[PDB]
Design a protein around this ligand. Sequence first.
Ligand SMILES: COc1ccccc1CCN1C[C@@H](C(N)=O)CC1=O
Ligand SMILES: [Zn+2]
Length: 139
Amino acid sequence: SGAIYVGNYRVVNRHLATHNDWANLVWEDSSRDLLVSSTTAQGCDTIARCDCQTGVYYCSSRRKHYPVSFSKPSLIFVEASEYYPARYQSHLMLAVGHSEPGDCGGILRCQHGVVGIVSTGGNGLVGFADVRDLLWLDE
Ligand SMILES: COc1ccccc1CCN1C[C@@H](C(N)=O)CC1=O
Ligand SMILES: [Zn+2]
């Protein structure tokens, strides 16, 4: 689990969104595994606006933050899971790192701010849904 809190937005994995998220919906995209809802309180996270390919992510199944090198956002085939059939997910970045299903939502960040959230993984890989192109999160 986990979310990004920027301005009056809450960014979560679409597959982990709550009823309150759907009832206060701003935007959602199944192909990216992202959903954004509105919040009453202002958040403290800032979004990175950069082309970093190195950063640090939070892994809840280890209670640890790990430095990683990650690929550029792209269209990647993701195996069937409890939440989606096998399909191509867009704007996804891959790295070598530990992950388990409940690690989705952990933040990946660089020197500029939040880059994205854990969305996929298995067998010593972790994938992150990029948010750096979502310029409207800043206004
Ligand atoms: C960190 O995630 C994992 C790690 C190990 C094994 C599996 C996962 C997550 C599996 N997935 C992929 C998600 C998606 N399509 O974006 C939906 C889902 O349930
Ligand atoms: Zn950066």
